RNA sequence: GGCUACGUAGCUCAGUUGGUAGAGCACAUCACUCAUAAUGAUGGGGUCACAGGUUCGAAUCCCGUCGUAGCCACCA
RNA sequence: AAAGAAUUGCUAGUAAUACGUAAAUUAGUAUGUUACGGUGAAUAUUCUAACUGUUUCGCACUAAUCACUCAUCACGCGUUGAA
RNA sequence: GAAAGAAUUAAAUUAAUAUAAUGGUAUAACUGUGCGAUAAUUGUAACACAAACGAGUGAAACAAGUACGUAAGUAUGGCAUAAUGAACAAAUAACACUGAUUGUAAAGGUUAUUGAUAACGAAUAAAAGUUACGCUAGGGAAGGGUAAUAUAGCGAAAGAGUAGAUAUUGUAAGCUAUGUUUGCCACCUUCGACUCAACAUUUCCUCUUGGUUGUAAAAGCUAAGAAGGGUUUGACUGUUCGUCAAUUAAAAUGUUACGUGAGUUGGGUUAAAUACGAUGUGAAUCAGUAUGGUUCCUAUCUGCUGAAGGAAA
RNA sequence: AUAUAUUUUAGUAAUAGAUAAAAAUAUGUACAGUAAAAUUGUAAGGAAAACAAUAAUAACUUUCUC
RNA sequence: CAAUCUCUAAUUGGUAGUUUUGAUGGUCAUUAUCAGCAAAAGUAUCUGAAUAAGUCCAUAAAUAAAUAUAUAAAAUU
RNA sequence: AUAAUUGAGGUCCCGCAUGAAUGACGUAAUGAUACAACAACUGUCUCCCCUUUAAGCUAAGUGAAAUUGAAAUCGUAGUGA
RNA sequence: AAUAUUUAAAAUCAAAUAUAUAUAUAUUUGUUAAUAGAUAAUAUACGGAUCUUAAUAAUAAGAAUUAUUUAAUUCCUUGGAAUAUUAUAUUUUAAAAUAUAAAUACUGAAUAUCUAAAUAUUAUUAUUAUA
RNA sequence: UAGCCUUUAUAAAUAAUAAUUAUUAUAUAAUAUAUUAUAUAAAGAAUGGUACAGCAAUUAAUAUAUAUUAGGGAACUAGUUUUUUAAUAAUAUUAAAUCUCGAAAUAUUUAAUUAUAUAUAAUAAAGAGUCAGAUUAUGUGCGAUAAGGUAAAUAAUCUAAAGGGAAACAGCCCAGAUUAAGAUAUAAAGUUCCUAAUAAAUAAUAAGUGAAAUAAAUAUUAAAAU
């Protein structure tokens, strides 16, 4: 006899973060083999086509008319925003830094070049 | 010619599966298409082997060949390759080797069909009864006026079921992808896509 | 991973201490014979194992790898 | 690019000759045949194979050594032993 | 009205992708071309995915430097998912950290790199068999289920039957029953002979009966009822079976722990002895052959065969 | 026309285009483009070598012109 | 010479200590892809695979490409 | 050979898988070896019967054993580790 | 009557529900039975008895099987109303009239409630003497 | 070792569990062809590719007095027709573990809201046991659409669960024993007797069919409808 008793395990390749879900920077929203979902707004894409969040926000799945026949995952900076954002409106940006109210810290930062 | 022995280039073993109980009301291959009289399954969905089908065909032929311009349309092909282990062997230790070809036959499906120039219906009926004596199901004579079997105890006329243009229906109640495409086609996106 | 010493012709084998393309061998044709062979003579093919240097001059020395195997190392 | 084992002719007007000449056969064709002259040599008997006549000895051969002839093995049909 | 350009629409990812298969890829991830050959770079890497640990995967950002690009920017190897291996012990460098009295040293550490443990989380640098002379600890880490097969039946009837499928026969395929065979499952850890048999009926004989151009008669053949009675003795073999001989009205087929070893036997199967053929380097071994060869039991209960006592008559 | 001198040419070798599915540098970056099959043909050429051809121009810009 | 002591080497079932994986009648043990897998993910068995893997690909197509030819300058001549 | 022989002896040789001191082959004698045949004999058997003694049984005396969760311990069918 | 199919509510018709509503639209429901085939071994084996009704004749039985149902029956919107039934009482001549009731089928667990008791926790009290 | 269990605690604590809202369309009304409110309909934010459904592309199967490409025959004087042989096209019809162009429900799953707080998650410090499982139902692999078989997936029970029902019964149908009590509601299952509890209605059966473990093709006899 000779049996075909050999197989790899399942690659855990679902969506790891869902519509309306809060995200943090670096977090993986999708694991996939090839771009089933394309990286949308405020979202990066890795070597393994893994969509990850570039900013803190709300994970949103959407279609964009500019790219028909392509699904997108992006991160809205608030829950208020429809994440296929209006084209000619200005981009919702995050400053994401804090001023150094502390005097010593500010001085150190000024010194550093 | 090849209905009882398919010529798949890459011959391969197959899982057992199940005979499809067509819960949605299929009526596909459950209608007289080629001939005047036919033989349909009447019982529960069943597997018919290649050999059994061949024997049924042969039985039918005895009546068909004497006819002027006599014809037999074999409606189903034995597409599923069945392997078997021996009764001699123990359980486990791989899968058995190829044995025969077989077809999964839903409740309402037509198996055969005939039409001669000088074919009286009684003779055809007799032939189909004799064909049925060799097959594992319980079978039924079907004429062009006789209506389509769906369930075990249920019936249907295809003439009744409605005609629909599905593009129009889609337009009425559109999917998200379709809407996105329509938006893309519009000028405020098509001009500024910048490819 | 390092170190060897061998691989000429279809077969067997020379040749080797440099100034060589040579042997019989089994194989196909005639040859003397009632006929057939044994024996006599026709010729046969070598990149002298892939492939580069030193002497007008190396198949033979210095070798770049190929083939098939040895040997050492490492062997936790 | 004067030719391997082998093998042919020839002792004198012979062989040899890149010496020529003629006829027979033809309507026509000689590297053949049959004939003619010209010039003209070299060598030499003792040993062995063959083959003719001589002889010695032998001879189971006589269609005469392609003679005759011996045994197994194989094929059939008897006979008689052993068991 | 014409020419040129910009192109758009439709189709396509069936080609091509270093390589399997899958997903993705023309907005190309595919292909061509310039430069280049650098990012197949150096320190910190949060946060996620995955996840027992060991590991694995994606990766924002901060800092040093590099390449291409007018710029925006892009590059921490390859469209993605395989391409792998712990410690220990050695080895090579760099580091300037320790330097066993002090100074050097040795030796250890840090950082980078090296070769395999494929039984692939790797027990050692280094290990095969045999026992029917065996031993200890434990585990069970014919009956039951099934009915493929087997046996029997049914439906339909190709076809034999001098003619007519259905007197008799009945391909291959169809639908069942049985638990009598050979299997499968793993809940559950002795063949034959003798003796005595009980039960079944799917009846071999005997009784009744239907059919039989294939019942003239007589012998038969086939089918229905029928289990009352009956159903073998020898040669060979351990055999059941089978072959034969002689009979019989007939020499039916099963079930009963393939009835019956606390009833008998022990020929077969079987351990120790031994030999043979084969297998093995060998000890020994065998879906082999042969000679020899170990269990016993006063019956408590049930049950059955007989026999009493007591009793409510 | 011819002699010498001094030079120059001739080492004769493919890409001529940001080349685009013959083969060749498989990682970076920048720019650009589209394959395949099938069909109709064509010197040897034949089922199978190579080359050609094979979806639609509404609107827009520029140019010439009635 | 040989014998004995000490060191060193060859040989050894003569003799002693050990061992003889897990799964199977030589084949499977690690990794990847699809199905099985039942529209998230996961999912087994001596399940089916035209299964595939223990890799492959790099230091290279160079040099030259602005002040030049006789003479004189050096505000580019 | 037997009414009838998977046994025995003789003979043949596709010796699955004989063979010469793991000796080869054929004999005389021997053997509580193994197998087979003939004779004779018989209770081995057809087919058992009768008899004898020691037990068995009863009475007297002495007085075991293995075993035993507890037992007020029937048949059949069904069920059920 | 005869021949030949089908055994069906898809269509069709009928009935019911929901939206505008004497109609339309949408939905839901309604389409055979018996026998034979039939079958092994301790003993019939629905768990057992036994169960298919019958006038004369009962103050009285009439599936204890299968299928669709109800809780007396019929309309109206679980509820009321009417109808007869059954039982009883009263009055009149064994009958008639009047009225009261029954209509909530029942059994059924160590389920739940009630009824009491115990412990533990949460939240309120009372009495007695980290109060 | 993780999973599941236990003990003791911790909070700028509800982060847990369940559902709703979220969408699309219609009608009406009010503002500026758009927005809000109300009502109704629609398996109703996001993710998906199984059933079903389908034959598109892939892989397979069938048919054409149809067309083309050649071949084998065949009749008249190389040309031509017919009866065709395969392939390709066209048209019609079909199916698949590794086909899905359509496509559910269950599912995964997010925010806020409401409801569960005599309740959950999370964290901290500590103790375990377990790693032989079984059956039933559904969807599969293996087996023969065999097994009280084997292998896993989901749920439940048993395991460790007594009580009622299923004749008897680990796994089925109900239901979870703190101790009693026994009036009232009952569950599953029952109500001729054994045995706690019953009366009716309308049909059908006559075979003891059947009456708590439904046996098939087929045959005969009826019965309806056309
Ligand atoms: Mg996988
Ligand atoms: Mg289907
Ligand atoms: Mg001349
Ligand atoms: Mg002439
Ligand atoms: Mg002369
Ligand atoms: Mg003489
Ligand atoms: Mg692909
Ligand atoms: Mg996780
Ligand atoms: Mg971890
Ligand atoms: Mg790349
Ligand atoms: Mg690549
Ligand atoms: Mg070690
Ligand atoms: Mg020191
Ligand atoms: Mg291991
Ligand atoms: Mg391991
Ligand atoms: Mg280990
Ligand atoms: Mg080992
Ligand atoms: Mg022995
Ligand atoms: Mg016939
Ligand atoms: Mg048959
Ligand atoms: Mg059995
Ligand atoms: Mg009988
Ligand atoms: Mg008679
Ligand atoms: Mg009697
Ligand atoms: Mg027995
Ligand atoms: Mg006994
Ligand atoms: Mg006993
Ligand atoms: Mg003895
Ligand atoms: Mg030893
Ligand atoms: Mg899939
Ligand atoms: Mg899967
Ligand atoms: Mg899944
Ligand atoms: Mg699922
Ligand atoms: Mg004999
Ligand atoms: Mg005997
Ligand atoms: Mg010898
Ligand atoms: Mg010897
Ligand atoms: Mg001897
Ligand atoms: Mg002796
Ligand atoms: Mg006594
Ligand atoms: Mg029990
Ligand atoms: Mg309807
Ligand atoms: Mg019985
Ligand atoms: Mg009962
Ligand atoms: Mg209680
Ligand atoms: Mg643990
Ligand atoms: Mg909440
Ligand atoms: Mg699938
Ligand atoms: Mg789809
Ligand atoms: Mg386990
Ligand atoms: Mg089991
Ligand atoms: Mg336990
Ligand atoms: Mg219980
Ligand atoms: Mg529980
Ligand atoms: Mg409780
Ligand atoms: Mg009965
Ligand atoms: Mg029953």
UniProtKB/Swiss-Prot annotation, chain A:
Keywords: Mitochondrion, Ribonucleoprotein, Ribosomal protein, Transit peptide. It is found in: Mitochondrion. GO terms for cellular component: mitochondrial inner membrane; mitochondrial large ribosomal subunit; mitochondrion. One of its GO terms (biological process) is mitochondrial cytochrome c oxidase assembly. Signal peptide: none annotated. GO terms for molecular function: structural constituent of ribosome. It comes from the Eukaryota. Component of the mitochondrial large ribosomal subunit (mt-LSU). Mature yeast 74S mitochondrial ribosomes consist of a small (37S) and a large (54S) subunit. The 37S small subunit contains a 15S ribosomal RNA (15S mt-rRNA) and 34 different proteins. The 54S large subunit contains a 21S rRNA (21S mt-rRNA) and 46 different proteins. Component of the mitochondrial ribosome (mitoribosome), a dedicated translation machinery responsible for the synthesis of mitochondrial genome-encoded proteins, including at least some of the essential transmembrane subunits of the mitochondrial respiratory chain. The mitoribosomes are attached to the mitochondrial inner membrane and translation products are cotranslationally integrated into the membrane. Belongs to the bacterial ribosomal protein bL27 family. Present with 2300 molecules/cell in log phase SD medium. This is Large ribosomal subunit protein bL27m. It comes from Saccharomyces cerevisiae (strain ATCC 204508 / S288c). The lineage of its organism: Eukaryota, Fungi, Dikarya, Ascomycota, Saccharomycotina.
Swiss-Prot record, chain B:
The keyword Ribosomal protein applies. Present with 2900 molecules/cell in log phase SD medium. GO terms for molecular function: rRNA binding; structural constituent of ribosome. Component of the mitochondrial large ribosomal subunit (mt-LSU). Mature yeast 74S mitochondrial ribosomes consist of a small (37S) and a large (54S) subunit. The 37S small subunit contains a 15S ribosomal RNA (15S mt-rRNA) and 34 different proteins. The 54S large subunit contains a 21S rRNA (21S mt-rRNA) and 46 different proteins. One of its GO terms (cellular component) is mitochondrion. It is found in: Mitochondrion. Keywords: Mitochondrion, Ribonucleoprotein, Ribosomal protein, Transit peptide. Component of the mitochondrial ribosome (mitoribosome), a dedicated translation machinery responsible for the synthesis of mitochondrial genome-encoded proteins, including at least some of the essential transmembrane subunits of the mitochondrial respiratory chain. The mitoribosomes are attached to the mitochondrial inner membrane and translation products are cotranslationally integrated into the membrane. GO terms for biological process: mitochondrial translation. This is Large ribosomal subunit protein uL16m. The gene is MRPL16. It comes from Saccharomyces cerevisiae (strain ATCC 204508 / S288c) (Baker's yeast). Belongs to the universal ribosomal protein uL16 family. The keyword Mitochondrion applies.
């Amino acid at each position: 006899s000779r049996t075909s008793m050999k197989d790899s395990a399942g690659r855990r390749l679902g969506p790891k973060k869902y519509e309306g879900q809060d995200v943090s920077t670096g977090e993986i929203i999708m694991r996939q083999r090839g771009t089933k979902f394309y990286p949308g707004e405020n979202v990066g894409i890795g070597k393994d086509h893994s969509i990850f969040a570039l900013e803190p926000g709300v994970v949103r799945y959407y279609l964009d008319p500019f790219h028909p026949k392509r699904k997108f995952i992006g991160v809205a900076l608030r829950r208020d925003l429809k994440l296929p954002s209006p084209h000619f409106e200005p981009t919702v940006r995050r400053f994401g830094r804090f001023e150094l109210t502390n005097k010593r810290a500010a001085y150190k930062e000024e010194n550093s070049i | 010619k090849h209905e009882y022995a398919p010529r798949f280039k890459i011959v391969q073993k197959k899982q057992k599966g199940r005979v499809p109980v067509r819960t949605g009301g299929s009526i596909k291959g459950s209608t007289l298409q080629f001939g005047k009289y036919g033989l349909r399954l009447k019982s529960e969905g069943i597997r018919i082997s290649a050999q059994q089908l061949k024997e049924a065909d042969n039985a039918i032929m005895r009546y068909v060949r004497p006819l002027n311009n006599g014809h037999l349309w074999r409606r189903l092909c034995t597409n599923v390759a069945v392997c078997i282990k021996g009764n001699e062997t123990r359980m486990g230790k791989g899968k058995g080797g190829f044995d025969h070809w077989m077809v999964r036959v839903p409740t309402g499906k037509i198996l055969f069909e005939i039409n001669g120039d000088d074919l009286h219906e009684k003779v055809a009926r007799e032939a189909f009864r004799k064909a049925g004596t060799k097959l594992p199901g319980v079978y039924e004579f079907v004429s062009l006026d006789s209506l389509v079997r769906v369930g075990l105890h249920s019936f249907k006329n295809p003439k009744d079921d409605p005609v629909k243009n599905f593009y129009d229906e889609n337009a009425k109640k559109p999917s998200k992808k379709y809407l996105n495409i329509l938006k893309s086609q519009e000028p405020q996106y098509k001009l500024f896509r910048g490819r």
